[PDB]
Design a protein around this motif. Structure first.
Motif, PDB file in Angstrom:
ATOM      1  N   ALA A  23       0.810  -1.201   0.000  1.00 27.78           N
ATOM      2  CA  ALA A  23       0.000   0.000   0.000  1.00 27.78           C
ATOM      3  C   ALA A  23       0.847   1.256   0.000  1.00 27.78           C
ATOM      4  CB  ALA A  23      -0.856   0.017   1.255  1.00 27.78           C
TER       5      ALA A  23
ATOM      6  N   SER B 156      -1.589  -3.019   4.028  1.00 25.95           N
ATOM      7  CA  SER B 156      -2.140  -3.703   2.876  1.00 25.95           C
ATOM      8  C   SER B 156      -1.080  -4.048   1.818  1.00 25.95           C
ATOM      9  CB  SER B 156      -3.267  -2.891   2.307  1.00 25.95           C
ATOM     10  OG  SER B 156      -4.335  -2.838   3.209  1.00 25.95           O
TER      11      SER B 156
ATOM     12  N   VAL C 212      -1.067  -5.766  -2.477  1.00 25.65           N
ATOM     13  CA  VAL C 212      -1.834  -6.017  -3.686  1.00 25.65           C
ATOM     14  C   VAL C 212      -1.102  -7.066  -4.533  1.00 25.65           C
ATOM     15  CG1 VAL C 212      -2.741  -5.043  -5.811  1.00 25.65           C
ATOM     16  CG2 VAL C 212      -2.659  -3.642  -3.712  1.00 25.65           C
TER      17      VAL C 212
ATOM     18  N   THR D  39      -7.979  -9.397   6.328  1.00 30.35           N
ATOM     19  CA  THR D  39      -9.105  -9.485   5.410  1.00 30.35           C
ATOM     20  C   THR D  39      -8.539  -9.558   3.995  1.00 30.35           C
ATOM     21  OG1 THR D  39      -9.317  -7.155   5.169  1.00 30.35           O
ATOM     22  CG2 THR D  39     -10.536  -8.130   6.998  1.00 30.35           C
TER      23      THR D  39
ATOM     24  N   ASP E 168      -9.681  -9.146  -0.310  1.00 27.22           N
ATOM     25  CA  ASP E 168     -10.542  -9.017  -1.465  1.00 27.22           C
ATOM     26  C   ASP E 168      -9.867  -9.854  -2.543  1.00 27.22           C
ATOM     27  OD1 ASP E 168     -11.709  -8.217  -3.873  1.00 27.22           O
ATOM     28  OD2 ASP E 168     -12.058  -6.046  -3.159  1.00 27.22           O
TER      29      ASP E 168
ATOM     30  N   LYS F 168      -9.736  -8.332  -6.320  1.00 29.33           N
ATOM     31  CA  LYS F 168      -8.709  -7.319  -6.568  1.00 29.33           C
ATOM     32  C   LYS F 168      -7.363  -7.650  -5.931  1.00 29.33           C
ATOM     33  CE  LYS F 168     -11.877  -3.551  -7.402  1.00 29.33           C
ATOM     34  NZ  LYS F 168     -12.051  -2.100  -7.138  1.00 29.33           N
TER      35      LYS F 168
ATOM     36  N   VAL G 170      -6.320  -7.954  -2.771  1.00 28.82           N
ATOM     37  CA  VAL G 170      -5.923  -7.134  -1.644  1.00 28.82           C
ATOM     38  C   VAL G 170      -5.856  -7.992  -0.411  1.00 28.82           C
ATOM     39  CG1 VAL G 170      -6.445  -5.112  -0.256  1.00 28.82           C
ATOM     40  CG2 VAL G 170      -7.101  -5.153  -2.673  1.00 28.82           C
TER      41      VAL G 170
ATOM     42  N   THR H  44      -5.154  -7.211   3.715  1.00 27.57           N
ATOM     43  CA  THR H  44      -4.928  -6.229   4.770  1.00 27.57           C
ATOM     44  C   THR H  44      -4.759  -6.963   6.093  1.00 27.57           C
ATOM     45  OG1 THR H  44      -6.301  -4.655   3.552  1.00 27.57           O
ATOM     46  CG2 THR H  44      -5.778  -4.110   5.841  1.00 27.57           C
TER      47      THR H  44
ATOM     48  N   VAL I 178      -4.851  -1.059  -8.126  1.00 22.62           N
ATOM     49  CA  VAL I 178      -5.590  -1.125  -6.871  1.00 22.62           C
ATOM     50  C   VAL I 178      -4.812  -0.375  -5.786  1.00 22.62           C
ATOM     51  CG1 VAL I 178      -6.539  -2.661  -5.110  1.00 22.62           C
ATOM     52  CG2 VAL I 178      -6.710  -3.302  -7.480  1.00 22.62           C
TER      53      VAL I 178
ATOM     54  N   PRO J 130      -5.270   0.314  -1.906  1.00 25.29           N
ATOM     55  CA  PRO J 130      -5.912   0.118  -0.615  1.00 25.29           C
ATOM     56  C   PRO J 130      -5.520   1.215   0.371  1.00 25.29           C
ATOM     57  CG  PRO J 130      -4.214  -1.528  -0.943  1.00 25.29           C
ATOM     58  CD  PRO J 130      -4.258  -0.700  -2.208  1.00 25.29           C
TER      59      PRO J 130
ATOM     60  N   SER K  86     -14.941  -0.443  -3.991  1.00 22.29           N
ATOM     61  CA  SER K  86     -14.925  -1.702  -3.284  1.00 22.29           C
ATOM     62  C   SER K  86     -14.242  -1.522  -1.921  1.00 22.29           C
ATOM     63  CB  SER K  86     -14.364  -2.806  -4.137  1.00 22.29           C
ATOM     64  OG  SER K  86     -13.039  -2.570  -4.387  1.00 22.29           O
TER      65      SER K  86
ATOM     66  N   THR L 241     -13.501  -3.580   2.272  1.00 26.17           N
ATOM     67  CA  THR L 241     -13.630  -4.665   3.214  1.00 26.17           C
ATOM     68  C   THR L 241     -13.640  -4.072   4.618  1.00 26.17           C
ATOM     69  OG1 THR L 241     -11.314  -4.994   3.422  1.00 26.17           O
ATOM     70  CG2 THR L 241     -12.413  -6.222   1.624  1.00 26.17           C
TER      71      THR L 241
ATOM     72  N   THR M 268     -11.016  -0.867   4.719  1.00 23.44           N
ATOM     73  CA  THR M 268     -10.083  -0.723   3.627  1.00 23.44           C
ATOM     74  C   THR M 268     -10.873  -0.505   2.342  1.00 23.44           C
ATOM     75  OG1 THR M 268      -8.518  -2.152   4.805  1.00 23.44           O
ATOM     76  CG2 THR M 268      -8.075  -1.729   2.451  1.00 23.44           C
TER      77      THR M 268
ATOM     78  N   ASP N 172     -10.589   0.446  -1.925  1.00 21.50           N
ATOM     79  CA  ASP N 172      -9.796   0.631  -3.123  1.00 21.50           C
ATOM     80  C   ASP N 172     -10.097   2.036  -3.617  1.00 21.50           C
ATOM     81  OD1 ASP N 172      -8.408   0.748  -5.526  1.00 21.50           O
ATOM     82  OD2 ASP N 172      -9.678  -0.800  -6.529  1.00 21.50           O
TER      83      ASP N 172
END
Lengths: 406, 406, 407, 407
Positions: free
Chosen positions: B312, B352, B354, B375, B377, B380, B382, B384, C349, C351, C374, C376, C385, C387
């Motif tokens: 991030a 975070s 990616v 968590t 995603d 995408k 991600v 975290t 992306v 975050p 998006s 979470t 968090t 995007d």
């Protein structure tokens, strides 16, 4: 006003060694461990049973201070954990005389300081986790605290000073400082009193954050002059911390010592002993490196004082004044190579200063006696020196040029 | 293209110890002293008469390397000064067999490396200040150089690698590398060849500046894969330099080791021995501290490789990949205190990344096995994590969380 | 303590326009010129003879203030130079009624403000270079000052507030603020009283932070009256117009400063200096146009939004503002989105995390284009968090705002 | 190698005005919109039908360029969108003669430049989105491109230069530059040829640094033709107009970038995007007014001044420029001077040093107000130290310039 003689003498010390050693040291997880790790108090206090002091030699501690160029040592006589490293003469069972060590470490400490011409200072935590008095009977706690200090004032001969830490835990309470400090003045008239937060007229020294940018406050124009003091520890903890790898550069330590003097403060550099009272080898390395610098800086480190002479734009350079000399403290220098090996320091390097109105005879680097070229505008009080770079194979971090006047 | 087996093995070494030791060490003013300080060559070369190697113990050196987590050692067999630390078997009088030491130090070196399962590497300066051939008869110099290397290839058994330094001094000359490196391949097919400045097909490793931001190039898409290596020395000099106080922080050393792995390089950490071949105390301190870090990091330090997973905004964190796990390397963490004692690390601290598209089972810090909350995603990619702060009493500088997949 | 109603209403204003205009403006060399350039006082004060106000249009000014998103205007009614932009009703000859303008500019000003639903505020310099009373008879000067304010309190109807500046010139004097401010409260009970100090009286409603941007606002000791805070920025280095001051801040810094004010729970004044004849100069118009686009986009949060204990992840300057129905993510350091072949920086992306949100969220969307983001949550640890997508090509808002809608 | 005469003359121009204007301007979301926003080509290209050029006045534009101190103007004659702002004489229907404007804007442009003593330069995009030849028949596209340039070389009289942009889109193709540039040299021997690639041919006179600011300029290999350098800055993040791009740079950064270009031995283009109808937008006018004040003050060095091996003291961004009769100290990070009681920052003596001046100096004076500066020299080590006094209250030039006069 003028500083009292003992405060003049204090400001001449310049650099002290701070030493953290208590029961916490056996765990090697920092001096606040009992509280921050939510330890069971009974179980933590059993560490007294293994407090042997088997590797504490106060002469080695004093020698370390001497080698680093320190002129005083602040030892933890009792930390927040509440264990006393001296004979409390009946005040508490939670002292070194009830540990297998069976030695008054403070007595050894003071003797070793005197042999090396160092002032012994006693750190005393005023925020105490051991005695129930602290929370349950604060007035009685103050009596206990004061008695603990009384012992230090009365059993060891003349003491350089006291370093109190913890009043910040009860910011609004009456800590009865006229009586605590008045007792100190009765038995130890020339002791320096330091309170780590002025909270009382008898305070001699105030503490600041190492990154204080500007000159120190010395008190109102018609009040008592108070000195200032900054503190640095080598990693993130004060007590020994075996898995704290986050040690500062020796270069930052040197810069911080220089900076202290720039702003008109003393500086303490802290080491945490091992459980058994040994100086760890990591600390010895910092002592050796800073010690080389302080030996080079000796002509100004002690007697040098801030003076209204500023450095040019974009420079961190500064000036210290003694009665016979001014000294240019010059930073961000690079090492000099050759015509085809260039390390950064080879060009002419004009560093200017504003505030010197006397004609100068000679300027020279303290590390190698090289004479520097310079120019002056006496009307506007400008000095410009060619601050030559380091001879290959050296780098002092903060380089010092002595000015000699006509 | 796939790395050759010896280059795969090289990249798994991860960390090497660089050792600078020559006549220069007796002066303790840096390894380039003879040139940069314009020394008289006759007088400088008299240092051979006092080269006793009285405190060189290759076993202790090898043990130190093992303990710091190094898997290879690069020793200076001959530096620019041109003195050989081995028996040149007639090639030169300017070698250790013509010094009071009278010992083949390279022989001791390779024996000690093998006992500790370390690869011995030989640094060889190609820019030479001793032989008049260098300037006055370059073809003859190349023959001399090649013979000096041939000795190293033939009298010591299997050799981990060669580390050549100085072709940059004559950028436009023909250095006859096909024949130098071809000779190495004949006697030492599995040696790693490193040239410090690809200058020849036989090169296995290229060197980079420690501040290289991006992953390194491995060669053109259809050519031979070459590895990469960065180097750090603890102060400004490589040979010992007693009045160079400008040491980097141990923290910077750790971050540089981590950084090397981030960009897909090895890293050498350099120490300069004393005149008599001792590891200086200062170097021991950096090795103790780094060694704690590398022991903790062992699950990823060696096998871990860069992977297209970024961190991030505003963080320097990064990811390393092994065949079974990913590892989050997390920087700029703070120590956790209490509600009353705030040290900085106590809040939830979302970090975070990616690029991770697989569901994760468990994430845990290597230093203490604490399980982290996270968590994802998955669409995408991600991740975290709540990157909890250091337990009070610790600070790893670069903290490593191991990811376990479903 | 909670803010009094008038101070709550003040905190809702959010952004004000500060306007510097006096005789100094004709020289265009800053508002302190008379003193700092050691001008002959007689000759300087002759500028009254050329004070026509020929291009001052209070309606246009108020319209421009409305358009930039300001909810109040602080106009210099009298600066250190001591010239009054209103009819002092015989207190002084050194006022606009003795200048060719022959118009009470403050009267035009307050009428225009009311038509546009803006609060008029009156700046009044308390350090005065015009009347010799200031040095020769300070008690009489205080009477003069107080009467000058009394005129403002009595002849213009309800007044949004007063902005005093200069007590710092005599730090040790008794400025008789109980009597000055008490007079104001008598005639103007709901006026905001601001004293720029460089809390000086119980009647003070706002504390000032001129040309320094702090990390937190002082709201008073926990058991005393709540006071609001206010930051002031001028576009270059001077407050009055200064033709050869080219050292303008970026419009981006202005937007970031406005956002920052709200983050720390202050108002912000953005200052313009009018031309000699009372025109908004072109450079000020440009900053107003640009800021105005931002404040129009930010309107859902700019006014009602308040600081809230929700922090941003390590290494970001992002922050959160709270209204009674929404939270807003204020997101900085975004880049513009191109393509695969044209990469401008914003396309990956991105975050961005926040700590302190414990409620399940339904939808998050950028205020500028209604793009749905998006996200979470970890509700146990109160992590959000998102995007944070980059700017559509052709736009860059500097501070981008995502509205959170709750379940 | 030293610059050929036409390149010396180019380096003396110093500052140019870059003007982006095309169909994209009507949408005000940046010049790459058609591609980056994935627009339908038919629908986008309908904008020709509303291209009136109703507010394009080349005389006013040229006057503005003159006033900002620019000595040349680079106009977009055709951007990637592929619309030509001139009469292509049958090459394409997608030109201004097939728009309601019905005017050869390039003809108006060159006339206006000549009236104001400015060199007209023609930007031409070599990456073209309009003609299918670009991908379908690259050799035919090269003929099309070359023909488009031929028109510019033959129908407008002498041309200051050409500014090509887009070869980077097909890095490996043969762009037939010997023939394109050779055609240019045939009709326009003295034209400056610039190719933006961020030396692709011997005929190139200038290399660019678009949106990146280095610390040294490449002038070509040591025994080859000298090529000049040019830096480009746009006021926000886009080149074409972009209504919701609020991320403007400070006027101060623009001035510092202009100074910096000269320090490293480059020209600088400052870019404005016109409105759809060809007006200079007000925001751009503001930056031009402010820069124009600086360039008027800096005129004695801006044009003729060159880099020289004279460096500044540690921790300073100051630098030196050399003309045949003088050196000039370009001094940054100065503050405004107040009084004893008002301290604004600049009042203390401010020694700024330089290394490389070996000649005895007679007088040093600020260009903005002719104040004489005190100084000291060490001629042996070539040190000069000046007391760089601060700005008079009411001014701030950002980069202040002291002229050295020799003995």
């Amino acid at each position: 006003t003028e500083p009292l003689p003992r405060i003049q003498h204090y400001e001449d010390l310049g650099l002290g060694l701070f030493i953290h050693w208590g029961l916490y040291s056996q765990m090697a997880v920092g001096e606040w461990t009992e509280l921050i790790h939510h330890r069971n108090q009974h179980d933590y206090e059993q560490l007294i049973k293994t407090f042997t002091a088997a590797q504490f030699d106060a002469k080695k501690i004093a020698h370390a201070a001497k080698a680093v160029g320190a002129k005083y040592i602040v030892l933890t006589t009792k930390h927040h954990e509440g264990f006393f490293l001296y004979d409390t003469k009946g005040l508490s069972d939670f002292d070194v005389m009830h540990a297998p060590a069976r030695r008054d470490l403070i007595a050894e400490f003071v003797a070793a300081c005197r042999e090396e011409d160092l002032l012994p200072f006693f750190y005393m935590a005023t925020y105490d986790w051991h005695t129930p008095l602290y929370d349950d009977d604060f007035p009685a706690y103050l009596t206990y605290l004061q008695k603990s200090v009384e012992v230090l004032c009365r059993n060891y001969g003349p003491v350089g000073g006291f370093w109190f830490d913890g009043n910040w835990n009860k910011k609004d309470a009456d800590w009865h400082l006229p009586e605590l400090y008045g007792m100190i003045r009765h038995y130890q008239p020339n002791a320096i009193i330091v309170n780590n937060t002025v909270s009382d007229p008898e305070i001699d020294v105030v503490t600041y954050q190492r990154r204080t940018p500007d000159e120190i406050y010395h008190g109102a124009p018609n009040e008592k002059y108070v000195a200032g003091e900054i503190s640095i520890t080598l990693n993130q903890h004060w007590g020994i911390a075996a898995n704290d790898l986050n040690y500062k550069s020796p270069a930052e330590v040197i810069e911080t010592v220089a900076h202290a003097r720039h702003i008109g403060a003393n500086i303490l550099v802290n080491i945490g002993l091992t459980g058994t009272g040994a100086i760890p080898a990591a600390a010895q390395t910092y002592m050796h490196l800073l010690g080389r610098w302080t030996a080079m800086a000796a002509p100004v480190l002690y007697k040098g004082r801030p003076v209204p002479v500023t450095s040019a734009h974009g420079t961190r350079d500064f000036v210290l004044h003694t009665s016979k000399h001014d000294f240019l403290c010059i930073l961000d220098l690079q090492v000099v190579g050759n015509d085809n090996v260039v390390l950064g320091g080879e060009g002419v390097n004009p560093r200017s200063f504003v505030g010197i109105g006397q004609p100068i005879q000679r300027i020279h680097w303290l590390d190698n006696d090289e004479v520097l070229s310079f120019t002056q505008d006496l009307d506007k009080k400008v000095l410009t020196v060619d601050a030559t770079g380091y001879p290959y194979g050296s780098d002092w971090v903060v380089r010092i040029a002595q000015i000699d006047y006509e």
